[PDB]
Design a protein around this ligand. Sequence first.
Ligand SMILES: [Mg+2]
Lengths: 113, 211, 178, 59, 158
Amino acid sequence: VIPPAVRPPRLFDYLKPYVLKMHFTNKFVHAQVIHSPTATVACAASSQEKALRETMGVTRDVAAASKIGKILGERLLMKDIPAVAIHMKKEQRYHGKVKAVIDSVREAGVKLL
Amino acid sequence: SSEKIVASVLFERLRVVIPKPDPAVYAFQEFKFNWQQQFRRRYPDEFLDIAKNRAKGEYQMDYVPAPRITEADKNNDRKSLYRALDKKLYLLIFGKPFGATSDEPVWHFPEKVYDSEPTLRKCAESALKSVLGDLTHTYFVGNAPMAHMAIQPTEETPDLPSYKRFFFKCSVVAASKYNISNCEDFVWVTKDELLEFLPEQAEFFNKMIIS
Amino acid sequence: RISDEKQKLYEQCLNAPCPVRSLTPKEAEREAQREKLGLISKDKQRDMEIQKKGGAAAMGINTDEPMRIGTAGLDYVSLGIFSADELVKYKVTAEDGERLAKENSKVLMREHRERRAAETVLLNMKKAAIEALPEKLKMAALEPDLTPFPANRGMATLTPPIEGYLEKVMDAAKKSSS
Amino acid sequence: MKKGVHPQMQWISYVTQSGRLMHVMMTRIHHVGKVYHFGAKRQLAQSIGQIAKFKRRFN
Amino acid sequence: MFPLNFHYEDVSRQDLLLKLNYANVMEVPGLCEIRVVPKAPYNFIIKNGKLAMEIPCGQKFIQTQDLARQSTLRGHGMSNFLVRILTVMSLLDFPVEIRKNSIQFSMETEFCEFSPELEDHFEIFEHIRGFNVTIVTSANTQDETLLLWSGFLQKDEG
RNA sequence: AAACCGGGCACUACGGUGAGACGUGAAAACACCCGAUCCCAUUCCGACCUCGAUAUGUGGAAUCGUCUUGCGCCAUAUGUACUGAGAUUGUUCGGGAGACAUGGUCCAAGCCCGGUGA
Ligand SMILES: [Mg+2]
């Protein structure tokens, strides 16, 4: 079948302008928080960064995803962003690296919307 | 002008036995067998007793596997296709090749100078036939050369004309002995021993020959 | 006639138990809730029948002495492939399994990449040798060689041929045929 | 591979017509693994023709 | 380690690279999977027919809706099953047919009669029509499949 | 630093979706090549997905570029069909397709991370 175009969820009562999106490659893990009204990155954490690619041994596994999630949660609380909304792609489930990033963000003290 | 194409034969005996694997690979395979047995269905003893109840003794003949290290390996017996079973062997002949550096014999492959034949594979087959006598236990691999060498005259040998030497591959099929003629001497050597025999051409044959 | 006892034995083979019962964590909590309610599954009852007379050790599973690859008297140490001191020592545990699996992945990837690099270099030199030919000979050499592989060529195995083995078997077959 | 679903395996040995020893796996249907030898029993079948029958009969 | 995969990597791949025109080494075909299905009329009910498929495959078949049965072998199970098939093929002249990318083979009860490990427990394989064995290769041409099958089928008599 | 390159998000049918041919793997990136011990995948199967593992192999599959095009899509006729008002039993004043036909597949373009430039 022809795949339908993916739409953001429809607004019901409130805006919720901060959206968390995750990306994983063969070498690095990524996590971007997007400000939807301006299409700008409010906060981002990845193991490809110059300050982070040497402070951890493995930059591609589940442990790296957990570390990047904790770093992103601390950075989000530093920018006074109390809560984010989770966006999963077509192939992403609540398992493995996605689960590690989500659990580390929630454990850092950021509410999930 | 530039002519006299030379066709060479890389005559090959494949590995007789599998080489020793890496110890971690063997350890993981043995662990993978033993670990998966815990989660696999164990057939009852009565089904095995179909074979056990008629597991009948005989006059009995015990099998002894042949050792991987042969007497040719222990004696370092060259000209033998029964040594270095986990490695590959290559045929070198001792005589005068197409090059004219001197009138002294040197180790080389079976060559023949191309004159008028339709293919270079025919020239390589004629070169091999002139050495082993017949192509009964030989198998040529591919109509194309596996590699080539362009030999140009340098500042110290201006008498040698320019020519190209083309290498063809041939496999030993089943014969463990060959009648080698039209040469003074011959050996069966591994890749490392052939590189040691050819110290000036080792950088080319290290790429031409996959270890 | 056709034995119903033999069919029952084959059914017992098809529904044979395992030395240890593995449960999905979704199913493990369901089994725990069934235990809380007082309900016992048939497989749980069979597993408890196994555990009261032993367990994995009574069903040919032990950790400290793993089964070797091959039959008795013909293992890799006995065939001369491996020495005893150069064998990696392990136990049948998941902790050793992680180590062995990671090292196996590293070694296999390295060996595979070495083989592929060597094949790529050989293919490039084959193309260079093809392009350095006269036009008639280049056209002749560019044709595919569809000649089948010789069946008389062998396949490398753990043990070489015995010198007086194939000749004896072929002579016996030829004498029995005539 | 799902756990608790497949039969147990067994290591057996194969010996070819030249004496080469090979280890393969097998579904566990014996108590211990055994060595199996392969003969040359290719079992080709020949039928005597009508002309051959006539020659062996009346010549 | 195992002789079939080592034979493919050490002998057949380099010969196929030298014999055929390939742009890169990842165009060389290999073995993908082995599919085993029983021949069309069978009982579907007797435990004999189920155990006659479980034992030579080494893994459990899938039984869909009770109209179809199939076993798909990959990896080391495929190589183990294939070397077991190829060794018994030295005992007779079993016919195979070469598709565009597949090698179809009929595993009759005569094949199970000549398996040395299945000489005993032969009451399992009696009154069974047999199985269809499909060997799938990653070849784009029938000639490549024929060359690969000729490379894998090796015997000491010749 | 100001441009360029790679990836992620965003924009979007002139920007979509196919086909063919030619290229490209930058000291980097993406993917594949390799494995199935744990998580996960299979009403059988590492096929898919997943977890692992890659001093440097490959761009075969996908992913990037360039052209050629097919459907679409956008723009635009000319005429006609049909039609609103109005009775010289519609001699008037307006609207105007579908199918054709002609062209185009633009221009502009945001944020973050990494690399080269620095
Ligand atoms: Mg129109």
